[PDB]
């Protein structure tokens, strides 16, 4: 995020980091319950990547994080990578996350819910702060 | 480029698809929602994470960080997967697995 700010640690408890074998953060995701993470289809996750929950500072060794294996990747059949449309994947975890103050689920909408133009929302992540 | 060690956040507004098309044209589909163009931008490494909106005391996943400006321009809207268009697929996948 360009021109954002640092979060309060633990205050976005559904935010996960998707990391490869080397520990490299390549995408975010959101816990929707103890067993499932929602992410983008174009992140290209497989069962060799891991979901890291409970993190704030990826340079710190002193956080009690959960490094969670992925059992199965469910890329939505409707995903069109050429138009980047329907850009959603579900990750089923091999072993459940342990919910805590810093690890818990985001809510999902109903299909009919209205989110009006002009509403102020929030996005979070470890993406670049400067291009 | 600069990658942060610590988790970042930003507040940003939702756009309409009709208005978002003034930036992105026919690239904008019904299963996308645009947000930003407000002085912040999602950027490389944010993809897959949340766009959440608060109502009735709780945060709901409205978007999934997807794509946008190749330079993470803060005056161009970011494009997010529109969760309302995708949630029926989510709930089913959970319940079947």
């Amino acid at each position: 995020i360009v021109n954002g700010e640092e979060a309060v640690p633990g205050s976005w408890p559904w935010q996960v980091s998707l990391q490869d074998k080397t520990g490299f953060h390549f995408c975010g995701g959101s816990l929707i319950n103890e067993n499932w993470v929602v992410t983008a289809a174009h992140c290209g996750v497989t069962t060799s990547d891991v979901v890291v929950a409970g993190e704030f500072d990826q340079g710190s060794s002193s956080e009690k994080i959960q490094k969670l294996k992925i059992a199965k990747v469910f890329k939505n059949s409707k995903y069109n990578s050429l138009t980047i449309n329907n850009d959603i994947t579900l990750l089923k975890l091999s072993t459940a996350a342990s919910f805590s103050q810093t690890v818990s689920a985001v809510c999902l909408p109903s299909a009919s819910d209205d989110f009006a133009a002009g509403t102020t929302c929030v996005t979070t992540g470890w993406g670049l702060t400067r291009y | 480029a600069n990658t942060p060690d610590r988790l970042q956040q930003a507040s940003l507004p939702l756009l309409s698809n009709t208005n978002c098309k003034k930036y992105w044209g026919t690239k904008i589909k019904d299963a996308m929602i645009c947000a930003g163009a407000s002085g912040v931008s999602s950027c490389m490494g944010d993809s897959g994470g949340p766009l959440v909106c608060k109502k009735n005391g709780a945060w709901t996943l409205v978007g999934i960080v997807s794509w946008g400006s190749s330079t993470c321009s803060t005056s161009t809207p970011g494009v997010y997967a529109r969760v309302t268009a995708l949630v029926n697929w989510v709930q089913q996948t959970l319940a079947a697995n």
Partner: peptide
Amino acid sequence: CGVPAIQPVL
């Protein structure tokens, strides 16, 4: 869902 135990500050 949706209610952090550690409240975010924007």
